[PDB]
Scaffold this motif. Structure first.
Motif, short mmCIF file in Angstrom:
data_model
loop_
_atom_site.label_atom_id
_atom_site.label_comp_id
_atom_site.label_asym_id
_atom_site.label_seq_id
_atom_site.Cartn_x
_atom_site.Cartn_y
_atom_site.Cartn_z
N UNK C 4 1.04 -1.18 -0.12
CA UNK C 4 0.08 0.22 -0.21
C UNK C 4 1.05 1.08 0.01
N UNK C 5 2.14 1.25 1.29
CA UNK C 5 2.65 2.80 1.03
C UNK C 5 3.72 1.73 0.23
N UNK C 6 3.72 1.31 -0.36
CA UNK C 6 5.38 1.28 -1.36
C UNK C 6 4.92 2.02 -2.81
N UNK C 7 3.40 1.47 -2.73
CA UNK C 7 3.00 1.70 -4.00
C UNK C 7 3.17 3.40 -4.29
N UNK C 8 2.64 4.47 -2.88
CA UNK C 8 2.76 5.53 -3.75
C UNK C 8 4.46 6.18 -3.92
N UNK C 9 5.00 5.39 -2.94
CA UNK C 9 6.68 5.92 -2.85
C UNK C 9 6.81 5.63 -4.49
N UNK C 10 6.45 4.57 -5.16
CA UNK C 10 6.95 3.91 -6.30
C UNK C 10 6.11 5.09 -7.88
N UNK C 11 5.13 5.35 -7.07
CA UNK C 11 4.22 5.84 -7.64
C UNK C 11 4.70 8.12 -7.75
N UNK C 12 5.16 8.34 -7.02
CA UNK C 12 5.19 10.03 -7.17
C UNK C 12 6.71 10.20 -7.43
N UNK C 13 7.42 9.19 -7.21
CA UNK C 13 8.76 8.84 -7.51
C UNK C 13 8.76 8.99 -9.12
#
Lengths: 34, 34, 34
Positions: C4-13
């Motif tokens: 869940x949290x890892x997804x966003x990180x990879x998204x924003x990045x």
């Protein structure tokens, strides 16, 4: 007053960033100005 | 109706980006476009 | 077992990166290949 966790984030990022940033630049100049 | 927190995000982002974008570009042209 | 949290990180990045990468290529082709 603590850049412990922030450091890693900026460290790991610099890698993926430099890779894409450099890779793209390389190709762009490697003959991508057709 | 509030862009307080959103502002910072766009600020720190554009900053960190503009930094690497320019910095990386400078070096790449300063003699790193092998 | 949770990205869940890892997804966003990879998204924003990936977003910020893809932005600078694409943006650059766009201009270069938008009339910057002089």
């Amino acid at each position: 007053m603590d850049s412990a966790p922030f450091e890693l984030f900026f460290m790991i990022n610099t890698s993926i960033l430099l890779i894409f940033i450099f890779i793209v630049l390389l190709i762009h100049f490697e003959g991508w100005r057709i």
